[PDB]
Amino acid sequence: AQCDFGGPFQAYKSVNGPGNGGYYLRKTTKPGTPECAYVLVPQNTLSEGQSTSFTYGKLQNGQMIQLTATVTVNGDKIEVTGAGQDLSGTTTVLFSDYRSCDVMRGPDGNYELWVHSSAINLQSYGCCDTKFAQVAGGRPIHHTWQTYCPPLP
Numbered sequence: 001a002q003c004d005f006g007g008p009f010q011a012y013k014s015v016n017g018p019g020n021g022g023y024y025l026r027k028t029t030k031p032g033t034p035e036c037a038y039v040l041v042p043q044n045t046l047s048e049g050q051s052t053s054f055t056y057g058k059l060q061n062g063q064m065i066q067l068t069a070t071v072t073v074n075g076d077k078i079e080v081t082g083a084g085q086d087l088s089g090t091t092t093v094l095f096s097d098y099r100s101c102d103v104m105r106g107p108d109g110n111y112e113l114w115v116h117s118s119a120i121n122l123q124s125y126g127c128c129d130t131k132f133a134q135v136a137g138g139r140p141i142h143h144t145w146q147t148y149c150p151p152l153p
C-alpha cells in the first residue's frame with residue numbers, strides 16, 4: 001500500500017513512538033557513528049512543546065552504556081541539548097509512522113533511519129526504507145545497527 005510522505009510530522013509523536021522501548025540508529029549517511037547507537041523513548045509521555053530527559057547510548061565493551069540528555073519537541077523539530085558532539089542540536093522528522101521507524105535529517109545535515117527495537121530484526125522497514133532511499137539518494141549509506149548488537153537496556 002502507498003506511503004504518505006505528506007506531513008506534517010509531529011516530533012512529540014515520533015519521540016514517544018509506540019509508547020515503549022527505544023530506537024536503534026539503523027542507517028545513516030554520516031560516517032563514523034558509534035556501532036549500536038540508540039535512544040530510549042522518554043520515561044514519561046511528551047506533549048507538544050515540552051522538554052524532558054531521555055537515555056541514549058551505544059555498544060561499549062559488550063554492554064549498552066546509558067547516558068542522559070534533554071530533548072525538546074516543537075512541530076517537526078527534535079532539539080537535543082547535553083548529548084555531546086553527536087546527538088546534540090536539531091533533528092528534523094522527515095517521516096515517521098509513530099510506531100516502528102523514523103526518517104530524520106540529523107543536526108549535521110545527514111540523513112538517518114531509526115528503527116524501534118520491536119521492528120529492528122525485520123527484513124524490510126517498509127515505508128521508512130522507501131523514504132530513506134529517496135532522501136539519501138546516491139550518498140553513501142552506513143549501517144550502524146548489526147544483528148550482534150545487544151538488546152536495548
Ligand SMILES: NCCc1c[nH]c2ccc(O)cc12
Binds near residue numbers: 014087102
Ligand atoms: N523516535 C525518535 C528517534 C530519535 C532520533 N533522533 C532522536 C533524538 C532524540 C530522541 O529522544 C529521539 C530521537
